[PDB]
Amino acid sequence: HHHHHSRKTYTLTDYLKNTYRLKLYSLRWISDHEYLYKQENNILVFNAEYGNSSVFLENSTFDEFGHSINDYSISPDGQFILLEYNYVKQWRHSYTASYDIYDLNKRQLITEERIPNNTQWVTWSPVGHKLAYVWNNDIYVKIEPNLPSYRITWTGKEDIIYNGITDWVYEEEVFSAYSALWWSPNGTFLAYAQFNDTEVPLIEYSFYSDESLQYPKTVRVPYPKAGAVNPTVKFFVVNTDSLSSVTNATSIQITAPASMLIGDHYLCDVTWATQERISLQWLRRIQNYSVMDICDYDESSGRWNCLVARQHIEMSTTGWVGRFRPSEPHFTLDGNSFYKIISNEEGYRHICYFQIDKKDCTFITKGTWEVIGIEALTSDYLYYISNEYKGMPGGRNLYKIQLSDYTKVTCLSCELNPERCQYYSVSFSKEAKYYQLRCSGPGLPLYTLHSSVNDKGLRVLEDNSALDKMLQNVQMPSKKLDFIILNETKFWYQMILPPHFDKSKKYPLLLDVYAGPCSQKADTVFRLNWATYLASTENIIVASFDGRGSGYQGDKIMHAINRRLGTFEVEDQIEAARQFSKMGFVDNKRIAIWGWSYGGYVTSMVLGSGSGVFKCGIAVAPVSRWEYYDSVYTERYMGLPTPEDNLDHYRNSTVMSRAENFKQVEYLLIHGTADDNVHFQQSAQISKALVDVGVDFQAMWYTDEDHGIASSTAHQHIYTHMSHFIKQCFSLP
Amino acid sequence: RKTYTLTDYLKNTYRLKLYSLRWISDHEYLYKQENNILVFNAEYGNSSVFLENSTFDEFGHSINDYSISPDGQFILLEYNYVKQWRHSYTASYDIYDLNKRQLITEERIPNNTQWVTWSPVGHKLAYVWNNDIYVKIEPNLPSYRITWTGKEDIIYNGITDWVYEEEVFSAYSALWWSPNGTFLAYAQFNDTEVPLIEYSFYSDESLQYPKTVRVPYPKAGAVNPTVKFFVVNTDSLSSVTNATSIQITAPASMLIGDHYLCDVTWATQERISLQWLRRIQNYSVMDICDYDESSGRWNCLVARQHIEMSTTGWVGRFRPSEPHFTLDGNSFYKIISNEEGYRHICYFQIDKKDCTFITKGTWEVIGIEALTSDYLYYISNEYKGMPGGRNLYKIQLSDYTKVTCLSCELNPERCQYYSVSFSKEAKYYQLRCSGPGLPLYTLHSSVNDKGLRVLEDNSALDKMLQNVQMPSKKLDFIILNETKFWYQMILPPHFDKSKKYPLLLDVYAGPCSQKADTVFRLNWATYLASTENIIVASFDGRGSGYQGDKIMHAINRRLGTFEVEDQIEAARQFSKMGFVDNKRIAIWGWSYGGYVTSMVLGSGSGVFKCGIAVAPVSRWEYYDSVYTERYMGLPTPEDNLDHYRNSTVMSRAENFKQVEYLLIHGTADDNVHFQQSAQISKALVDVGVDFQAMWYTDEDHGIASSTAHQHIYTHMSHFIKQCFSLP
Numbered sequence A: 001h002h003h004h005h006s007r008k009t010y011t012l013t014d015y016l017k018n019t020y021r022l023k024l025y026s027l028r029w030i031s032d033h034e035y036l037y038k039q040e041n042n043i044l045v046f047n048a049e050y051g052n053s054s055v056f057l058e059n060s061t062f063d064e065f066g067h068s069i070n071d072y073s074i075s076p077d078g079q080f081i082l083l084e085y086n087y088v089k090q091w092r093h094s095y096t097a098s099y100d101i102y103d104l105n106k107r108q109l110i111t112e113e114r115i116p117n118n119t120q121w122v123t124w125s126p127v128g129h130k131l132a133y134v135w136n137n138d139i140y141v142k143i144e145p146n147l148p149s150y151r152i153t154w155t156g157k158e159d160i161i162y163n164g165i166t167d168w169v170y171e172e173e174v175f176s177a178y179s180a181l182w183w184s185p186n187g188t189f190l191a192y193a194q195f196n197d198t199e200v201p202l203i204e205y206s207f208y209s210d211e212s213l214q215y216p217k218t219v220r221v222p223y224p225k226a227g228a229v230n231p232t233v234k235f236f237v238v239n240t241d242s243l244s245s246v247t248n249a250t251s252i253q254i255t256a257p258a259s260m261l262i263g264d265h266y267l268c269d270v271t272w273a274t275q276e277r278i279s280l281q282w283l284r285r286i287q288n289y290s291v292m293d294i295c296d297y298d299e300s301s302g303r304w305n306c307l308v309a310r311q312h313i314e315m316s317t318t319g320w321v322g323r324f325r326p327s328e329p330h331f332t333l334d335g336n337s338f339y340k341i342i343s344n345e346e347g348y349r350h351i352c353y354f355q356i357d358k359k360d361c362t363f364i365t366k367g368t369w370e371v372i373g374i375e376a377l378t379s380d381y382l383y384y385i386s387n388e389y390k391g392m393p394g395g396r397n398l399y400k401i402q403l404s405d406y407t408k409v410t411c412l413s414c415e416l417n418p419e420r421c422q423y424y425s426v427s428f429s430k431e432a433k434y435y436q437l438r439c440s441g442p443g444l445p446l447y448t449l450h451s452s453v454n455d456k457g458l459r460v461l462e463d464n465s466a467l468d469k470m471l472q473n474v475q476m477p478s479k480k481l482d483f484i485i486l487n488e489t490k491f492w493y494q495m496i497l498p499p500h501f502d503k504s505k506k507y508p509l510l511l512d513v514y515a516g517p518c519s520q521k522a523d524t525v526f527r528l529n530w531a532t533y534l535a536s537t538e539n540i541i542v543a544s545f546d547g548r549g550s551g552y553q554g555d556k557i558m559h560a561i562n563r564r565l566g567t568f569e570v571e572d573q574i575e576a577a578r579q580f581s582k583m584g585f586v587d588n589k590r591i592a593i594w595g596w597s598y599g600g601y602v603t604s605m606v607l608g609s610g611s612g613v614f615k616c617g618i619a620v621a622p623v624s625r626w627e628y629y630d631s632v633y634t635e636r637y638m639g640l641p642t643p644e645d646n647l648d649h650y651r652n653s654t655v656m657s658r659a660e661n662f663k664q665v666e667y668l669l670i671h672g673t674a675d676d677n678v679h680f681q682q683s684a685q686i687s688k689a690l691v692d693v694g695v696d697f698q699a700m701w702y703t704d705e706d707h708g709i710a711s712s713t714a715h716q717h718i719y720t721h722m723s724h725f726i727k728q729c730f731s732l733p
Numbered sequence B: 001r002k003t004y005t006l007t008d009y010l011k012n013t014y015r016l017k018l019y020s021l022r023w024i025s026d027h028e029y030l031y032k033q034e035n036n037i038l039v040f041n042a043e044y045g046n047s048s049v050f051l052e053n054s055t056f057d058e059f060g061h062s063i064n065d066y067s068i069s070p071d072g073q074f075i076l077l078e079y080n081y082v083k084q085w086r087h088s089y090t091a092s093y094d095i096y097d098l099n100k101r102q103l104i105t106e107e108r109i110p111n112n113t114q115w116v117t118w119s120p121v122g123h124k125l126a127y128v129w130n131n132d133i134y135v136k137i138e139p140n141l142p143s144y145r146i147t148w149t150g151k152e153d154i155i156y157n158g159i160t161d162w163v164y165e166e167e168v169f170s171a172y173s174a175l176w177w178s179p180n181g182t183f184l185a186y187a188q189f190n191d192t193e194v195p196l197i198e199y200s201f202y203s204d205e206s207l208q209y210p211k212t213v214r215v216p217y218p219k220a221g222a223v224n225p226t227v228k229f230f231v232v233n234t235d236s237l238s239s240v241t242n243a244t245s246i247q248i249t250a251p252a253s254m255l256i257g258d259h260y261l262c263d264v265t266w267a268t269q270e271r272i273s274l275q276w277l278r279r280i281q282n283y284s285v286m287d288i289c290d291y292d293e294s295s296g297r298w299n300c301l302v303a304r305q306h307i308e309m310s311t312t313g314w315v316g317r318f319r320p321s322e323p324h325f326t327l328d329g330n331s332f333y334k335i336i337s338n339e340e341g342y343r344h345i346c347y348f349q350i351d352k353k354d355c356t357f358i359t360k361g362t363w364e365v366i367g368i369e370a371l372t373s374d375y376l377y378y379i380s381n382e383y384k385g386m387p388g389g390r391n392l393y394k395i396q397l398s399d400y401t402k403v404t405c406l407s408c409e410l411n412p413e414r415c416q417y418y419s420v421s422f423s424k425e426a427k428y429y430q431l432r433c434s435g436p437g438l439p440l441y442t443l444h445s446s447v448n449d450k451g452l453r454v455l456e457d458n459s460a461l462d463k464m465l466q467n468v469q470m471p472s473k474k475l476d477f478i479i480l481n482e483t484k485f486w487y488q489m490i491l492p493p494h495f496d497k498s499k500k501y502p503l504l505l506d507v508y509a510g511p512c513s514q515k516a517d518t519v520f521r522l523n524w525a526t527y528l529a530s531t532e533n534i535i536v537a538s539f540d541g542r543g544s545g546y547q548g549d550k551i552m553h554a555i556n557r558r559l560g561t562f563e564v565e566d567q568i569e570a571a572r573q574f575s576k577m578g579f580v581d582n583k584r585i586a587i588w589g590w591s592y593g594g595y596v597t598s599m600v601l602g603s604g605s606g607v608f609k610c611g612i613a614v615a616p617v618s619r620w621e622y623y624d625s626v627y628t629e630r631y632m633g634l635p636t637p638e639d640n641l642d643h644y645r646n647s648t649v650m651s652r653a654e655n656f657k658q659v660e661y662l663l664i665h666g667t668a669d670d671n672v673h674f675q676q677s678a679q680i681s682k683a684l685v686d687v688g689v690d691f692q693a694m695w696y697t698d699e700d701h702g703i704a705s706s707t708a709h710q711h712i713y714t715h716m717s718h719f720i721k722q723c724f725s726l727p
């Protein structure tokens, strides 16, 4: 006699075997009215207005191909499909692959002049079917799919010269992409960055590979640690229409402004404005100063000209520029002005409207909230995501502002489903006539289609009802999203609360931490994760706290840890736990902390703080000292580890110096051996320091795993392993 | 009423006193009385301060070690010691003139010297620096450069490369002076095509970017170093012309393929013996090479080659034994296995193939220790048929049936494990008894074999151990298939056989291993037995040594089979003993023992709850050629590839679901590469096995840093205690 009461919990196996699956609705806009979607491996084309679909491309087309196709890409004109196979992952975004081109009209594979194996990047022009690809660090262009390539660059050299692709740090920390190729709107010009790593030092580490490898391999990666010599960058633009088979291509260099060339600098943004106008943003190595160049194409010269009167300066007195880099501009059609997120006089990030020839911009939004991103720009409206609604920094809604009247702002997503939907992102059609809304929480994910004409809902794309159905009799956790006042400042936290939560009880608590610069761990997003299992099955509250340094709440909070990582952010996680225990439903004796990456650093710094608050903790791929980590991320917040700059705090903020204090806690330290991002080195130095003061701890290396510890088997193993560690620390049987 | 704690073991609360002497002549030896160096008269037992503590107060450096020249005119002082591999290191050197009481300051031994050796008589000095050999006739005079080919990681003159150091000579030096020092013989190793093991070295926290260590290291079936052998006449060295080094080429039977130089032994002033081993180590040849005056060359008569081979295994225990030549060098004695497969002393004439065995029986000679004109002195395990006992015997050369046990009856209850140190001409010997009681060091005179005196009786420790509840040791055998197999147990204090104790099986089980013996040890096992009331057992199964080839060769070509099964069976036999908790049996080992532990835990026997593998081999292709191939042959389709593939711990990953595993490894292990454990962990992850792990940053095979040593044992103790439900 169960009486249909929910007696199921969300278990670890549920998480690891993916029993309860979030359905997505992933589309690709090809026009201003149609999109593509995979139904049952068939590519269906969808008419956005009527909802009717036809099979665009059947799954039973490339079976004869003889290869497993990883992905595809259709040319803007709908005439060719790029088939991506032999995918081999490199870093977070980089990979190599083989490519074939299928003629969608002739219905045949192109067999002449095929894109080579081991291609590093491939991209169609934004219109028609021109191809640019990078192979062996050089850029090639095909005007037609079956025609010989034109080689654009002749200088590419493995690990040294990168043409059209980023090196390690630029991929990870600047562009969040491997691509460094930018086609102009109508595909006339192909702009590209060239990176130079000649004197960048190499991180070297063992890769053991399949057990059949007799001798381990040494992987060597140009990787600049804090203060080390950085890659240099050049920028070019080539006219693809004046290419020739008898003469080499002329790439016109756009040099960085003089303000940048006087020291180490970065290219931090490339954005085409018009057919013949490009904007470049450059960044000083000390990342409080950036210059946007705006460069026009001179017809008679065939060259590019950045008038110093169109240079725009963005700088910060309180910190670095932008959230992680200076924001991207959104140009009006004539390219004579643009909209950009910058922080205002109060430190809040808002949309500023700039004329191309004017220093002072006007802010079109304002308030004690922040604009997250500019999503679309038409001649009448600008569409943007912000956390204004209900003054919740961890919410996200789409708004549109009338360009001719800034007092006329409408929220497009706010009232659609207020209880289920408080975290939206958006996908606009080619000229913003339609948009897909994607709501991520706090309810189950919800994908809907809309016409921007009168903002009416067209249809529900995915409502996750099959999962809703599965979860009916599961004892699921809830989320509490709220704030505490500390030094008259709101600080947000979330708690994943076990089912049938009772404030009379004392629960064990796991502090799930990131706490890196511009991090946000308290939000309205619905997640099915390890925290879900721990609350649902193990009755642990999993809490996260956004303290000083956290993002989306202004620079006063964000810039608070400037030049000072390993301080207030660490301090606020500890204080959070004090506050959490003070709420009366937390077991003071069973409070734990864990994090990955920056969160691993904070976990390690907290556990070594001597606070006495935390019983135990798990650091996964943590930073241990800032000199070990990459220059662009680290120097953004820390400056240079030189005696003239910030070496003292580089030295004061290592986890190693806190080793003695680990005698008070139970510690699990986890690192993948092939971690190219935070090097295994970092945890190897933690372990050695812990051994040297005689502190016992738990450790787990993951052979050949990288920063993600993302292999199917390793993912399952680490979470199983951490689960045992937490259950044991909490005396859970 | 106190027990022997982990801290006791870790902090060496209870020391075993040694009596380390180094003989200086046929009746004098040096002893390091703490700060001082004393010369002791072996005759009278009296001492004078040979070298004071504050003599080198003004030195300004920390002296690692000293070394007196044979004639006693000069002392070599060693400092700036930097360990390399197990035997190899670098050091700075000064020579101190004992006749004058001052440091030599001209033509000094360079910094970063790889090896130094005095000639056997007088004060000539040979040394190796930047892989080349230099000789100093006088300590203050310019050194003569012998070799000009030395090159880091590539050409090694007078020093060994990684594999020869670890697996062949158990030493860094490859320099051999003739008895009166006229000739300097040396080997030359060439690692040109030997592939490099590469691993990360993290170093001090201040190192921004890790270093890649790269070491020429042949894994099983890879390209080996090649070896050449040379002899130089140090008496006719010129300061004008280059030294002429006369090559002795390996025999024709060795030059046919890959081979090793495995032994160098001078017979006389002008006769050197060389032993060479084929890469397939079941065939070796001794060369007897004579100096020719009219030639200036060395001649090795083919009719003087002595072959030593094996049909059931490899040659020697770990390598063919060394010959002990008579004074004229026309005959020699060496240990070889007889027709029953037992290792015994055979007497050879230089010019004939047949030798005569001078010892016989179902026990083995461990080593020849000295030969005089009238007696041959050897150590063996004949006494009471105990392969784990060790005694010194003398065989009357004029009559082989006249064998006297010199140590058997000295203190039969306290002392069953002897080693010995004879004086220059064997006039005296020091006996070292390692157990079963507290170690006892005694001086004797060989003319009448009487005891001169007790040197160190370890009474200071005895008085301390009075207060502690100390564990006992049982050494005994079980019968498996009509064969004795020996085991030892470290039993908790006040052992009650009506009580059930958790058991930990301490394993080595490598070929020629012996873990059951009469030696007194203060170790981790001592603490586990004394404080934790855990029985710690070791078992010598098939593959184990000192019991003949039938047992030792049992695992030939078949590593990870019979010696794995025998540890399992031993544990089954220990459970049938009635005082063992069959719910709490664990297994652990280091190196080969890590391999066997892992193999046992992945066997699916169900016998073991848990275990710890420290720096284990995981598959034989990852380990060095010399050791691995000795037993496994080559990992090729036409040799032993199939068993190489069959004998991995990775292939057993699925069975680790039944046990609790701790896998431990130093990241800078040049010997058993971290790779080996990294492959185990990956295989366990791939089948969804949860286990426990620990890397030791920058630690090598020994995991021997004071702090790492303490951390590993503390970590293992918590693991065993948790496995055993011990609070």
Ligand SMILES: *[C@@H]1O[C@H](CO)[C@@H](O[C@@H]2O[C@H](CO)[C@@H](O)[C@H](O)[C@H]2NC(C)=O)[C@H](O)[C@H]1NC(C)=O
Binding pocket: B092, B108, B109, B110, B111
């Ligand atoms: C061995 O090493 C030490 C240190 O490198 C040498 O001593 C130094 O010699 C240099 C010569 O350039 C002087 O500048 C220093 O005054 C010396 N410093 C120390 C620490 O003593 C030494 O000379 C080297 N060679 C030998 C054979 O002694």
Ligand SMILES: Cn1c(=O)cc(N2CCC[C@@H](N)C2)n(Cc2ccccc2C#N)c1=O
Binding pocket: A172, A173, A324, A514, A516, A596, A597, A598, A599, A623, A629, A633, A677, A678
């Ligand atoms: C938890 N988390 C994340 O989820 C994502 C992060 N980032 C933020 C910066 C851009 C990328 N490198 C990803 N970071 C920043 C970071 C700090 C220190 C060491 C490693 C990383 C990384 N990847 C991060 O900490």
Ligand SMILES: Cn1c(=O)cc(N2CCC[C@@H](N)C2)n(Cc2ccccc2C#N)c1=O
Binding pocket: B166, B167, B318, B508, B510, B590, B591, B592, B593, B617, B623, B627, B671, B672
């Ligand atoms: C326990 N133990 C020892 O105590 C000594 C060992 N040896 C025996 C052979 C000569 C040296 N390499 C030392 N070996 C052999 C060995 C087998 C497999 C992997 C590593 C080693 C090592 N050092 C050994 O296992």
